[PDB]
Design a protein around this ligand. Sequence first.
Ligand SMILES: CC(=O)N[C@@H]1[C@@H](O[C@@H]2O[C@H](CO)[C@H](O)[C@H](O[C@H]3O[C@H](CO)[C@H](O)[C@H](O)[C@H]3NC(C)=O)[C@H]2O[C@@H]2O[C@@H](C)[C@@H](O)[C@@H](O)[C@@H]2O)[C@H](O)[C@@H](CO)O[C@H]1O
Ligand SMILES: CC(=O)N[C@@H]1[C@@H](O[C@@H]2O[C@H](CO)[C@H](O)[C@H](O[C@H]3O[C@H](CO)[C@H](O)[C@H](O)[C@H]3NC(C)=O)[C@H]2O[C@@H]2O[C@@H](C)[C@@H](O)[C@@H](O)[C@@H]2O)[C@H](O)[C@@H](CO)O[C@H]1O
Ligand code: NA
Ligand code: NA
Lengths: 302, 311
Amino acid sequence: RAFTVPNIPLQTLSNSRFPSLIQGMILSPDASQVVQFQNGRCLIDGQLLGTTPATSGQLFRVRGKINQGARTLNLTEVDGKPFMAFDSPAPVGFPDFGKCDWHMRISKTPNNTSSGDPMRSVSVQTNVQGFVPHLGSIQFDEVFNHPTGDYIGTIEWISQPSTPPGTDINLWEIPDYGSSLSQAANLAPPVFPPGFGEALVYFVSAFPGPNNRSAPNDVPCLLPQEYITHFVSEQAPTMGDAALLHYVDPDTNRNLGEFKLYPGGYLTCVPNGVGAGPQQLPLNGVFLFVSWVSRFYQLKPV
Amino acid sequence: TIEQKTRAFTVPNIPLQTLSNSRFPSLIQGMILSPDASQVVQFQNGRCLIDGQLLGTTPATSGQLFRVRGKINQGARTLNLTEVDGKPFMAFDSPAPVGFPDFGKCDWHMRISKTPNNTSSGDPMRSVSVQTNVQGFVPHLGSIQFDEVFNHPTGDYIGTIEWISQPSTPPGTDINLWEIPDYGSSLSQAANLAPPVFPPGFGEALVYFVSAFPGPNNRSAPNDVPCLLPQEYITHFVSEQAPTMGDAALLHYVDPDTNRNLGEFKLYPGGYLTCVPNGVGAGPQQLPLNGVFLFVSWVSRFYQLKPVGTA
Ligand SMILES: CC(=O)N[C@@H]1[C@@H](O[C@@H]2O[C@H](CO)[C@H](O)[C@H](O[C@H]3O[C@H](CO)[C@H](O)[C@H](O)[C@H]3NC(C)=O)[C@H]2O[C@@H]2O[C@@H](C)[C@@H](O)[C@@H](O)[C@@H]2O)[C@H](O)[C@@H](CO)O[C@H]1O
Ligand SMILES: CC(=O)N[C@@H]1[C@@H](O[C@@H]2O[C@H](CO)[C@H](O)[C@H](O[C@H]3O[C@H](CO)[C@H](O)[C@H](O)[C@H]3NC(C)=O)[C@H]2O[C@@H]2O[C@@H](C)[C@@H](O)[C@@H](O)[C@@H]2O)[C@H](O)[C@@H](CO)O[C@H]1O
Ligand code: NA
Ligand code: NA
C-alpha cells in the first residue's frame, strides 16, 4: 500500500488531544522542549501509542463508576468495557492535559428518567495522590453527593493547577498517570528536538479557561486526528527514514514549504533563522506526500 | 489528472464500534431501522455524496461538528450566529452555519463561554436554553433566541448543546430526533437544505447509526441520535473524491475474527445505506458492533441483497 496523507486543508483538520479544529502550526517556544503527549500518538504505519484513539469519537472522554458519597471514579473504557490496568497508562482517549486543574461535566448513563438536568460538575487535580488513572481511578476534589452509577463526560474548562500554588497552566506537559508505588506502563515515549537545524512542528487549538497570562490556553499536538485515522485505516508500511511532504496552497498548487514526517508520527521543518517557521504560513494549505527520504536528506528551510 | 478520474472507491477500514456519529461527536453505539417503516429523514449534518460533495450544514471533519458560535449583547436574548471559526455566516446561502446542530423536536440546553480567554481566574461557562419551534429560532436568518435574558458581558461566545429535553411546546410531546428543526421563518424558508432521504421500498430499508445523547425523554430511555453515515466516511469521501462508478456500492459487514460476511448493504451515492430485513423484528440491530464494512463491487440499484438478521 502506497503512503498518503489526507487531502484536506489544515484549518479543517482536528487537534488530536481534544476535538477541535486546528488553529495554528508552531514551533515550541522553548527550542529544547521535550514532549510526551499520550494522545495524538501514532506510528505512520497505523500503530497507535499511549492512550491514542483511532478516531475523535473516543478522544478526550472520561467514563467510570462512582458511588454516592465517594470521591473516586473507577475508570472504564469510553464504551463501558473494563479498563485493563497495568497494560496502558489510562483508558483509550483519556485526557492528557498536565499541569492544570480539570473542571469536568459528567452525567449518569444511560438515561432512565423522564425529567431533570443530568449534568454534574466535578473537579480533578492531576498532581495529587488520588490521580492514578494507571491504577484505574481518579479522585474528585469534593465528595460526589449524586446518585451511584456509570458516568460519562469530559473536561469542560481548565484552570491553574492548585499545587504548587501560583504555578501556571503548562499544556506542554502530561499528568503523572502512575502512583507512589507504581510507574505507568506503556507510556508513549518522549519526542526530543531532532537537532541538525530541524525543529518539531505542533498543531495548536485553544481550550476554555483562565491562566496566569490572561490569554488563551493553547493545546499543542503532534498530528491532526484525521492523519491518525487515515494511518490506522491505510496501514501503509514505512519505507524511509522520513516521508517528505510539501505544504501546498490548493488555490495555486504552489509549494509553500518542505516538511519531514517521521515514522514515529511527528513532523519537522527547518526554520530559516529566527522569526521564520511554519507559523508564518497560511492555514489553508494541504500536506502532500512527495517521496520517502533517507536520514541524509536536508530540508529546504521554510 | 488520469489518476484523479480513475481513483478507486474505498471506505475506511475501521470497525463500526470505533467510528463516530455524524450528527454529534460520539462513538457509534448501534445500527437500527427507523421504528416507522415510512420514516423520511432530512438531517442537515452527516450528509455527503459518496464522491465527496458535502450537503446541508455538514462539516468535512468532526472539529466543526455540533458547535455554535455567535455574538450576543448583554441584556439581550439574541445570539447573532457566525461560522465556528468566527467568520461571518453568509445567510440565504445555507440553512445555518457549518456544523450547526440539527436536533429537531427538543429543547436545547447549551453551555457557552466568551472567547478568547482574557481572565486569570473564574468559571467562564454559561448555561442558556434554546427552544427550536419558537419564532426567534431563525438560524437561516442568522440568529437564535435564548429562553432568558443574557446578563453577562457582550461578546463572542462559543459552545454546544450539553443536554436535551422534551420540547416545551406543544406541552407533553416527546423528543423526536428523527426530525430537524425549522431553520427559517413563516415568511422566509430555509435555502439550500440537504434534500430528504426516502425509504427505498421493495424490501430495502434505511440503516441508521445511533449514539446516546444526554437528557430525559417521555420514555425514560436513552436519547438515541440517528445518522446516515459515520463521520469518518464523510471525511474519507471529501479527501478521496473517488468518482461514483455505479448506482450503488455493495458493502459486506465482515466479522474481523472469522472473515465471514454478517450482512449485505447497499451504499447509495446520495450518502446512505440500506439493507433487507430478514422478516419482522429482524435487522442490523442484531449484528455485533465490531464488524467492518468492506467495499465489494459497484452494483445496479436493482441488485437484491441477502436478507440480514433473524425474525
Ligand atoms: C486555598 C483554599 O482552599 N481556599 C478556599 C477557597 O477556594 C478557592 O477560592 C478561590 C477564589 O477565592 C478560587 O476559586 C480557588 O480555585 C480556583 O483557583 C485555583 C488556583 O490555585 C485553581 O485553579 C482552581 O482549579 C480554581 N477553581 C475554580 C472553580 O475556579 C479555590 O481553591 C480551590 O478550591 C478549594 C476548595 C480547594 O479545593 C483548593 O485546592 C482549590 O484550588 C474558597 O472559596 C473559600 C470559601 O469556601 O475557602 C477557602 O479556604
Ligand atoms: C410552564 C412553566 O413555565 N412553568 C414554570 C416552571 O418551569 C418549569 O418547571 C418544570 C419543573 O416543575 C420543568 O423544569 C420545566 O422545564 C423542563 O421541562 C420542559 C417540558 O415540560 C422542557 O423539557 C424544558 O426544557 C425542561 N427544562 C429543564 C431545565 O429541565 C419548566 O419549564 C421551562 O422553564 C420555564 C421557565 C419556561 O421557559 C418554559 O417554557 C420551560 O418549558 C418554573 O420553574 C417556575 C418558575 O420557577 O414557573 C413556572 O410557571
Ligand atoms: Na499520579
Ligand atoms: Na424557525
